[PDB]
Amino acid sequence: QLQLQESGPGLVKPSETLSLTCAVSGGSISNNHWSWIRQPPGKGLEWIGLISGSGGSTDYNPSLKSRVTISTDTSKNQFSLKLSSVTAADTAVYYCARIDVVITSHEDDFGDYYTGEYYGLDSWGQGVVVTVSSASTKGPSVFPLAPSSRSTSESTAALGCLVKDYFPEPVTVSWNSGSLTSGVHTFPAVLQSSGLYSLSSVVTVPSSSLGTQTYVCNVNHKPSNTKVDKRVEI
């Protein structure tokens, strides 16, 4: 099972270089072609470029001019992207993917020359949020959201974590190390006047479990290397 995972700094300063890596598991880099795609917030998909795994032959989106480099690393089974001289126009979610290619022969003298036709992108990574900004990285403070007396008198109750005052996006939240998935709802972040984001995540659980079951929210903020498992006291 081919699994791709993008990684790299989430905050890039204007005019600097964006560097992202795509770790490939469940298959070899050399046995496929690989591509980078990006998607600005609330906009459509845009192709960045592709590279032949064993071949190193590359093609780039012409409008990216000479700001774009794609590379491969066999010993780490990764491929990479470098985008130089970035601006706020490069803020976007960046995806890596496999691209399906079929090579066609055509006998010459001589002899035969090959031709390539490219088809669909699959095995997409989850994408990595990149923000181009002069603002500073800040990791969040995580506070408990405890249900009210009235709320715990109902048959179920929502408890949660407030992930407060971070930059840049994004933050992820799981509950009980991912063993708790049903009833979880993580809300999209709000951007405050302070320039920082906050989000909330809640899980609705049986009121009978309150004060006997342990609930922990696992908050990750990769840009600041923040990883906190916060016990929600009841």
Binding site: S35, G44, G120, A158, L162
Partner: protein
């Protein structure tokens, strides 16, 4: 090269939906189709004009001829609501091109009033002299609400910030609103309330220091 896609398409459940991808002689290129449910990643639906990816049901079919390629979804259901992109490879210049994407909405979704949960500040936050009230608003349709905060009955303004509605996985909408206050401010009123208005009806929740 250019790929053209209407921004939206609406159809009723069970009906047939048609998403079009127009391009000068696109009929001579191989067309792929992607389905995306943000913030999830895109999923390849159709390749080479009309070959379904594994796990894509027969009611999705593709065609390509002349200056238009089409993705047809028959028997549309709620699970089909999503953005659809067409895509081609131009071998002449070696460039991959995407259409702007078409958002498909399934009509006839019943009106749903928001559920609202309001949280007071935590002890932890108050001992740092801050107080953030959190009002979480979920499961509403259509995707539009107005939120108003009150302190002991008198409108609050401000310290209030509210997200745009975002689509949940079940096709209803969610939003949240935050009231940021100082510990002192929070202790000065007997009651705070979050009032959410949707389609002419309101839902209110109250918290007290």
């Amino acid at each position: 090269y250019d790929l053209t896609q209407a921004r939206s398409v609406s159809v009723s459940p069970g009906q047939t939906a048609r998403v079009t991808c127009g391009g000068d002689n696109i009929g001579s290129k191989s067309v792929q189709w992607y389905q995306q449910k943000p913030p999830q990643a895109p999923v390849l639906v159709m390749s080479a004009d009309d070959e379904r990816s594994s796990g894509i049901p027969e009611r999705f079919s593709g065609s390509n001829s002349g200056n238009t390629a089409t993705l047809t979804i028959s028997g549309v259901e709620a699970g089909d609501e999503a953005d659809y992109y067409c895509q081609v490879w131009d071998s002449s210049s070696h460039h991959m091109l995407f259409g702007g994407g078409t958002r498909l909405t399934v009509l006839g979704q019943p009106k749903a009033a928001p559920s609202v949960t309001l949280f007071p500040p935590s002890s932890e936050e108050l001992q740092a002299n801050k107080a953030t009230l959190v009002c979480l608003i979920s499961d509403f349709y259509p995707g539009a609400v107005e939120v108003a905060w009150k302190a002991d009955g008198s409108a609050v303004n401000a310290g209030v910030e509210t997200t745009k509605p975002s689509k949940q996985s079940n096709n209803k909408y969610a939003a949240s609103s935050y009231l940021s206050l100082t510990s002192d401010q929070w202790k000065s009123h007997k009651s705070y309330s979050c009032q959410v208005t949707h389609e002419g009806s309101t839902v209110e929740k109250t918290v007290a220091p």
